[PDB]
């Protein structure tokens, strides 16, 4: 499957690298370390969308990035791996609000699957793309479920194209 | 195929973004703009065996710095950093002389996950076939890409680990 290769590469080539570094990168962020509501990476997995999170939910906006990890990989001495912090503002019946700060990003391989459906040379119809997205979510779920270094450091968020509601509910 | 998804992702998520920017990043480098004359990304494609550190493998290859980074809003990450490294090659010649070259060279990172998929549900011969399919598909993708034309060189090789400098200098001289 196309999705199985994208899922394993997403683990070996990214999550396995950054998730063991996440807590250290947070603690180095003088601006965010005391603000971060939850110390996990929230990975958005839209099934029919597509990459700006604010355009998916107006209550979520980017406010800053964590300090980058510099990793020697692929002949690149200091390749940059950094996460983004997003602020969630939940309006209430009182007319009041309450703010949260989450480390959240889209699953990047899903963006390539969408790009593969917009070019016929990639041999991916819209129907086949939606199936491969589901296969990607399932394979990535079982890979991370058996991971030692990533244990307790992530949260997968599959949804159909509400994000702020899901994130706030999961934190509670 | 597994290799087809990795090749398309390598194009849509990287090459299609950085190759149209490469010329500009080179010209923005005060130190490297006149030292790098092959203004293209040399992509190493190890086929048989595969460490990813280029400079410790060959005493003639040394990392001497980075180009200016490209910043692209992507996947919810604002200003995600895409940056190339520059390697200096000091090539001894048979007559005792030395010649100095500068290259933008890097490994095709998706191949690293293919080797990781095997050395930790993919047999060795299955990996070798998927690597071959990745190279073929990537060659086809880039051959039809107008925004990547003249900006790349694909280098399939065994993985000769201490022969990269020989391969790069030969390719510069169109050998
Ligand atoms: N959110 C996020 N931030 C990152 O820094 C990151 N780096 C990789 N990935 C995703 O993990 C998976 C495996 O990574 P890999 O390096 O093998 O392939 C990458 C890699 O070969 C190349 N590439 C992308 N960015 C860079 C970069 N900055 N330097 C060198 N190569 C890069 O193009 C491929 C696809 O990139 P992405 O399409 O962004 O998704 C990747 C991929 O799905 C990332 N995802």
Curated annotation (Swiss-Prot), chain A:
Where is the protein localized?
A: Membrane
For this UniProt record, give its keywords in alphabetical order, as a comma-separated list: Immunity, Innate immunity, Membrane, Transmembrane, Transmembrane helix
Q: Would the keyword Membrane turn up in this protein's UniProt record?
A: yes
Q: Name the principal localization, coarsely classed.
A: membrane
- Any keyword Membrane? yes
Q: Name one GO biological process term.
A: positive regulation of macroautophagy
Function, as annotated, reads:
Facilitator of innate immune signaling that acts as a sensor of second messenger signals produced by cyclic GMP-AMP synthase-like receptors (cGLRs) and promotes the production of type I interferon. Innate immune response is triggered in response to nucleotides from viruses and bacteria delivered to the cytoplasm. Acts by binding cyclic dinucleotides: recognizes and binds cyclic UMP-AMP (2',3'-cUAMP) and 2'-3' linked cGAMP (2'-3'-cGAMP), two second messengers produced by cGLRs in response to nucleotides in the cytosol, such as double-stranded RNA (dsRNA).
A single Gene Ontology MF term assigned here is:
2',3'-cyclic GMP-AMP binding
* GO cellular component terms attached to this protein's record: autophagosome; endoplasmic reticulum membrane
Q: What is this protein called?
A: Stimulator of interferon genes protein 1
Q: Which domain of life is it from?
A: Eukaryota
Q: Report the sequence similarity comment from the record.
A: Belongs to the STING family.
Q: Which residues take part in binding 2',3'-cUAMP?
A: 14, 73, 77, 79, 108
Q: Which gene encodes it?
A: STING1
Source organism per entry reads Stylophora pistillata
Q: Which residues bind 2',3'-cGAMP?
A: 14, 73, 79
């Amino acid at each position: 499957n196309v999705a199985d290769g994208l899922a394993w590469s997403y683990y070996f080539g990214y999550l396995r690298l950054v998730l063991p570094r996440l807590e250290l990168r947070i603690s180095e962020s003088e601006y965010f370390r005391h603000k971060i509501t939850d110390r996990k990476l929230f990975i958005l997995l839209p099934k029919t969308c597509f990459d700006d999170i604010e355009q998916a939910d107006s209550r979520v906006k980017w406010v800053g990035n964590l300090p980058e990890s510099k990793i020697n990989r692929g002949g690149i001495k200091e390749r940059s791996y950094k996460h983004a912090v997003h602020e969630i503002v939940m309006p209430f019946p009182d007319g009041t609000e309450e703010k949260y700060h989450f480390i959240v990003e889209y699953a990047t391989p899903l963006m390539s699957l969408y790009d593969m459906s917009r070019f016929t040379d990639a041999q991916l119809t819209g129907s086949e793309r939606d199936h491969q997205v589901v296969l990607f979510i399932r394979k990535l779920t079982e890979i991370l479920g058996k991971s030692e270094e990533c244990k307790g450091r992530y949260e997968l968020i599959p949804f159909s194209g509400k994000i702020a509601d899901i994130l706030v509910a999961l934190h509670n």
